[PDB]
Design a protein around this ligand. Sequence first.
Ligand SMILES: NC(=O)c1ccc[n+]([C@@H]2O[C@H](COP(=O)([O-])OP(=O)(O)OC[C@H]3O[C@@H](n4cnc5c(N)ncnc54)[C@H](O)[C@@H]3O)[C@@H](O)[C@H]2O)c1
Ligand SMILES: NC(=O)c1ccc[n+]([C@@H]2O[C@H](COP(=O)([O-])OP(=O)(O)OC[C@H]3O[C@@H](n4cnc5c(N)ncnc54)[C@H](O)[C@@H]3O)[C@@H](O)[C@H]2O)c1
Ligand SMILES: NC(=O)c1ccc[n+]([C@@H]2O[C@H](COP(=O)([O-])OP(=O)(O)OC[C@H]3O[C@@H](n4cnc5c(N)ncnc54)[C@H](O)[C@@H]3O)[C@@H](O)[C@H]2O)c1
Ligand SMILES: NC(=O)c1ccc[n+]([C@@H]2O[C@H](COP(=O)([O-])OP(=O)(O)OC[C@H]3O[C@@H](n4cnc5c(N)ncnc54)[C@H](O)[C@@H]3O)[C@@H](O)[C@H]2O)c1
Lengths: 244, 244, 244, 244
Amino acid sequence: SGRLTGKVALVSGGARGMGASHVRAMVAEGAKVVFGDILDEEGKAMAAELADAARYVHLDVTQPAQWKAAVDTAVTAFGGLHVLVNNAGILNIGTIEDYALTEWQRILDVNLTGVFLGIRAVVKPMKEAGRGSIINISSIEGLAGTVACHGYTATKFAVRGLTKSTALELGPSGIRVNSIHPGLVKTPMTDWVPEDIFQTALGRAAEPVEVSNLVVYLASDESSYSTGAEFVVDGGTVAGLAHN
Amino acid sequence: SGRLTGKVALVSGGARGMGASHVRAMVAEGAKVVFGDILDEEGKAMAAELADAARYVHLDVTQPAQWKAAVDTAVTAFGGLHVLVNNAGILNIGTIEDYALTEWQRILDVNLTGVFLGIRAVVKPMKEAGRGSIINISSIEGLAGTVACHGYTATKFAVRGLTKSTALELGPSGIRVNSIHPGLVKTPMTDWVPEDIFQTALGRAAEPVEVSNLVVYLASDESSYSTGAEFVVDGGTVAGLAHN
Amino acid sequence: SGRLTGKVALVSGGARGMGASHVRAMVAEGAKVVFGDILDEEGKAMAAELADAARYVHLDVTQPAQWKAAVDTAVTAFGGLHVLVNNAGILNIGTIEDYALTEWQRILDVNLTGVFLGIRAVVKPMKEAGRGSIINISSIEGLAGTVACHGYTATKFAVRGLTKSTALELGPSGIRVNSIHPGLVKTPMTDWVPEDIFQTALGRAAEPVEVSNLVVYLASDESSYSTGAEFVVDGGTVAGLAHN
Amino acid sequence: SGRLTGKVALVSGGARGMGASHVRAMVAEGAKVVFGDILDEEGKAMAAELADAARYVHLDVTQPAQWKAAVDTAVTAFGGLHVLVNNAGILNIGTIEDYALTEWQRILDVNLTGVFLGIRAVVKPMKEAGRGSIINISSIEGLAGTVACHGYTATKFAVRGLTKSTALELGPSGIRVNSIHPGLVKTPMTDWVPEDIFQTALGRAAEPVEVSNLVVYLASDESSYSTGAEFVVDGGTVAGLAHN
Ligand SMILES: NC(=O)c1ccc[n+]([C@@H]2O[C@H](COP(=O)([O-])OP(=O)(O)OC[C@H]3O[C@@H](n4cnc5c(N)ncnc54)[C@H](O)[C@@H]3O)[C@@H](O)[C@H]2O)c1
Ligand SMILES: NC(=O)c1ccc[n+]([C@@H]2O[C@H](COP(=O)([O-])OP(=O)(O)OC[C@H]3O[C@@H](n4cnc5c(N)ncnc54)[C@H](O)[C@@H]3O)[C@@H](O)[C@H]2O)c1
Ligand SMILES: NC(=O)c1ccc[n+]([C@@H]2O[C@H](COP(=O)([O-])OP(=O)(O)OC[C@H]3O[C@@H](n4cnc5c(N)ncnc54)[C@H](O)[C@@H]3O)[C@@H](O)[C@H]2O)c1
Ligand SMILES: NC(=O)c1ccc[n+]([C@@H]2O[C@H](COP(=O)([O-])OP(=O)(O)OC[C@H]3O[C@@H](n4cnc5c(N)ncnc54)[C@H](O)[C@@H]3O)[C@@H](O)[C@H]2O)c1
């Protein structure tokens, strides 16, 4: 408790799934949270139950103007902005033959460009504050490949890289940038996926809060010397070789 | 030797720099090469000296129709297509604040989407042949970050990941996909960069042919059991830790 | 908070430096800690101030019998053992020609075998508890090489690998195994090294507690879905490319 | 053919398996080869059929004196020494509970120390020549973990690291050092292992010559700008995530 005292965070894609879990987890640690999404109905709903510590904003991460508005909301409503959780993302699949180029561009827009746009938008207030933490949500698909998962793999790897380039540039201003790489997490994005799809050492899929616990760590000043790094929370999948 | 005799290859961005070096290197090893670029003047120039061993075609890697035309050219002129070298690429830079969104979009289109389009275009002729080798040109900027080099870092990391997802999917068809990661290479793309910018064990920048030698290895059947892997040719930069 | 209340931990090399910082940090979070070392003077000294929260034991990590005695101490004094911090280690250097074989053998014994012996010693009490967290201290020298630092590099890379093999094997028993990779940390091991030797995004060396914060996270149940993974705390060094 | 003209190489563990394959492959490319092992019967046998281009020497890689003798044999019998293939290795397994410490030390001695001793022994003549290539045989077990494979995993990771530290130190002298990481290869070491143990994109185990082709590339001057790097030849295993 209180591990995020005085902190203000902005979470993209926070109306449901892991994003919603991150909002709740940070609020529980004392942070004020602005969360944006395109699911306004659900967004306003949870904002009502977290009203005193969180605010919902309509945010399509593919639009820079909306990102600016989200950041201004945090600054004007809560006083500042110290944490950014680039969580918004989509999942589409397809083999090289069936995958539509429109699907490829769409996932690049949301999963990659959306993350970059978020970073661009939060740096001004963070630099003025002299401190900040940017947490980009990648995945283990950003560490290795998967059949018929080209756009998703490409963007998750890209996010992994962008985390490092921005980390190097922003470090001198007191802003850390790290990426989180989870394995299968029980959320609506993978509800159709069997929980044991991956070979894991722990033998189970993850609960969203297990990823939120990592977000809290990275958002807090406890992780003050970690930047440009990959934090894996996958139950051990990438730690082992793929066996038959 | 004639390490590539019987092989037909398609090289993007082959009008100059490493691309041109790769075309010459493979032709020297007995390959028939179709190479495309947007620099038609220079492209047609070298096509003339390479005689009946190589054909030049205008190819903007961001356009799927042009990729298809280049592949059709290779199949009709040489009877098939067994090797693809996704070499075309651009370099732009800028801090998070100053970097233009148009530049970000353009580099994603050329460096990332262009590579994916190349893969899509060659799958058919390669699967028909039951064999194939796709070589994607990433870089050490696809292994670590660089200040004010976000679009480039993101795309090179993306290419690294796409190499893996496609390798897994195409393996069953006898097609290998690998990525090459060079350090500073002496070409027009980085002629404005001091040659000793990187801390190398070899204490020098790379010569294009030194990368072409790796392209030949991966294009040949000698590398038959290597796929989805990263081949680093950087003089030792990423093998060491960055010192101040 | 009391993020480790109820947990019992064993820390090797806990008489000074990071080890001592880890013991203090975990005790502050409610853990009961048994810490061992070969520096008995300093070890007993801090055990006295930590009072009933910590016990000091002489522990040469190269000796299996001493590891067993330390574990028995933890179980008898605190009722069990849930966390192991394999922190003991030494640093020696030398060029390929000048580096003494005795030094190579000694560092393998302490930095590598010592870590394995620790893992062996705690498996029983942890499996009995059905839970556990093993934290192995590697370093960025376990991610990249360093001139005239062969024994150290080899062992730190080995620890990184051992972390994975054991994580996979122990996962089914509810035991997590992860590795920590710090950059330059201000301790007596590297006091002879200039603090700005590495190119860091944060432009400074690490403080021991900054690593201890990561140890606490991994020791706590908050990191329940992370195992077999590398946690980097280097201020951004490995996230960037080495410049000359 | 002739890709190793004028080159003299030393191969440890070359009496059978991959080592024997490497000897044959390099001899076929014009290299003179001294190969050492502890299987003298078999060693002298193949030396008789390759007599004009290869010489067998008794070499226990755990003994520095024997390494010196092997190097002197290459220098005095063939005129110099330009390539070293640290191939000698053993495989033992066991869970944390059953694995004997004698087995652990033995594999550290052969797989790790043996490799270091080889590097120490070849540097003198290589530095005098001003050029050389050291090829260390690691494995994908040096990139990820495996249950009940602790000593093997630890040593293969260690070899991976030692490759980088030595590469950085030796680069200025014109000596490159790289590591090879193969997947399952059909040799007597894994004859008891099912060929489809790993999930591979190519759907088959490797033939030793497929690894030897990589040794030839790295031994040749074609790979002149690659050093401190990992070359994976595993049919795509590590390129993908472990799925059930
Ligand atoms: N579910 C998993 O197993 C898993 C594993 C690794 C990584 N991830 C990543 O975690 C993130 C969240 O995943 P999730 O499991 O909660 O999925 P989810 O579908 O539940 O939530 C994603 C959220 O992003 C919002 N969103 C989508 N497009 C948006 C846009 N253009 N602008 C703003 N908001 C947008 C969605 O409405 C939704 O609320 C994603 O980046 C995903 O790739 C998920
Ligand atoms: N120069 C280096 O140091 C270095 C280091 C690592 C990686 N690389 C990569 O190697 C590749 C080639 O680099 P280079 O050094 O020869 O650069 P270069 O500028 O000399 O050549 C790149 C070529 O691509 C062509 N090209 C650009 N956009 C194109 C498009 N849309 N369609 C078709 N062709 C297009 C250019 O006209 C040019 O001929 C790039 O992918 C680059 O990122 C270069
Ligand atoms: N100092 C750094 O910058 C740095 C960076 C990365 C990793 N590390 C690692 O962190 C660990 C602790 O480092 P430190 O900075 O506190 O060094 P340190 O010298 O201050 O402490 C190491 C401790 O281990 C003890 N020790 C040594 N050999 C032992 C043995 N055989 N049995 C039991 N105890 C033994 C020492 O007496 C000492 O108390 C080591 O594994 C080291 O490699 C240190
Ligand atoms: N077989 C595989 O699938 C596979 C996969 C990855 C890596 N590797 C590695 O490749 C290398 C060769 O493997 P292999 O498949 O040919 O095994 P192998 O058993 O056929 O050959 C290993 C050789 O090393 C020799 N040797 C063993 N201990 C020695 C010592 N102390 N001194 C000198 N020589 C010694 C053996 O007598 C034998 O000729 C090893 O390092 C192994 O770990 C093998």
